[PDB]
Swiss-Prot record:
Chain segments carrying region Sufficient for interaction with KANSL1: 1-263
Residues annotated to bind propanoyl-CoA: I141, T143, R149, G153, K154, S178, S187
Cellular localization per UniProt: Nucleus; Chromosome; Mitochondrion
PTM statement from Swiss-Prot or TrEMBL: Acetylation at Lys-98 facilitates cognate substrate Lys-binding and acetylation. Although considered as an autoacetylation event, acetylation at Lys-98 probably takes place via a non-enzymatic process following acetyl-CoA-binding, which primes KAT8 for cognate protein-lysine acetylation. Deacetylated by SIRT1.
Section of the entire sequence shown: 177 to 447 of 458
Membrane-spanning parts: none
UniProt domain MYST-type HAT: residue ranges: 1-263
Residue list for modification N6-acetyllysine: K98
GO cellular component: chromosome; histone acetyltransferase complex; kinetochore; mitochondrion; MLL1 complex; MSL complex; NSL complex; NuA4 histone acetyltransferase complex
Lineage: Eukaryota, Metazoa, Chordata, Craniata, Vertebrata
Impact noted for substituting E174Q: Abolishes histone acetyltransferase activity without abolishing non-enzymatic 'autoacetylation'. Abolished ability to regulate mitochondrial gene expression
Effect of K5N: In LIGOWS; uncertain significance; no effect on protein expression; no effect on MSL complex assembly; decreased histone acetyltransferase activity
Protein name as catalogued: Histone acetyltransferase KAT8
Length: 263
């Protein structure tokens, strides 16, 4: 038997995939998760007791972004082990290809929250290696199911490249991506590149956006704005073609002004 469903905050969510909740927890049909500290519990009674006792009303670590009622928390895997393990086991219920749950010390986690009077409610996250050999600016990324396809996915994608720009490096998500992941990255890449070309080599676009040359090429390929000549990719842009494509912005965007972060 695997964990079939979770209660988190006011949400009931059915599992998509196996998640190795350890020992007797992994043998429970339903797990009850504190929406703040992400502690996983076996029974409604232990959950209700924890609701009254737990003092956490936000993720741990540093609030590195705040605009209106959207905030992003930076949680270092080394300083907040239990929290980051809890998050990885939650994420694995809804990510097929995530493989790391417990060995979290090498990772930083960026928690997207929407805030009200009660506290900061987890919407989604992405994990990131502190040191990436392959130059991955995102390890795993997820919007929790009840929040999917409402702008939040593209927000965390945007946020990951805002970090990469401040690092003065190029980045690509660790593959494979989910079907949703693939569509959201493509949409984001397109929006960024179209908005620039509306107003420059492929290298220039890579330095401006922190998007890899390969990701830019595949995006310009999908837009039919690149040609191949004697073994070189050539940008073939037409202001009418660019304006026609734009004829969309995500509901919420990352404001660099509201990002308080240094490498
Ligand atoms: Zn708690």
């Amino acid at each position: 038997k695997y964990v079939d469903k979770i209660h988190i905050g006011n949400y009931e969510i059915d599992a998509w995939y196996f998640s190795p909740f350890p020992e007797d927890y992994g043998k429970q049909p339903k797990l009850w998760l504190c929406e703040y500290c992400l502690k996983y519990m076996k029974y409604e009674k232990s959950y209700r007791f924890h609701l009254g006792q737990c003092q956490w009303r936000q993720p741990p670590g540093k609030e590195i972004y705040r605009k209106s009622n959207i905030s992003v928390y930076e949680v270092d895997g080394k300083d907040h082990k239990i929290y980051c393990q809890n998050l990885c086991l939650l994420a694995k219920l809804f990510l097929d290809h995530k493989t790391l749950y417990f060995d979290v010390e090498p990772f930083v986690f960026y928690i997207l929250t929407e805030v009200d009077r009660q506290g900061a409610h987890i919407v989604g996250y992405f994990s990131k290696e502190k040191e990436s050999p392959d130059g991955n600016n995102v390890a795993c990324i997820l919007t929790l199911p009840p929040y999917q396809r409402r702008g939040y996915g593209k927000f965390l994608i945007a946020f990951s490249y805002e970090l990469s720009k401040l690092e003065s490096t190029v980045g690509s998500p660790e593959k494979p991506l989910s079907d949703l992941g693939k569509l959201s990255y493509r949409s984001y890449w397109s929006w960024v590149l179209l908005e620039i070309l509306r107003d420059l080599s492929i290298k220039d676009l890579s330095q401006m956006t922190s998007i890899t040359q390969n990701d830019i090429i595949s995006t310009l390929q999908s837009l039919n704005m690149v040609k191949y000549w004697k073994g070189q990719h050539v940008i073939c842009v037409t202001p009418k073609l660019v304006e026609e494509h734009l004829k969309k912005k995500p509901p919420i965007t990352v404001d660099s002004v509201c990002l308080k972060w240094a490498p």
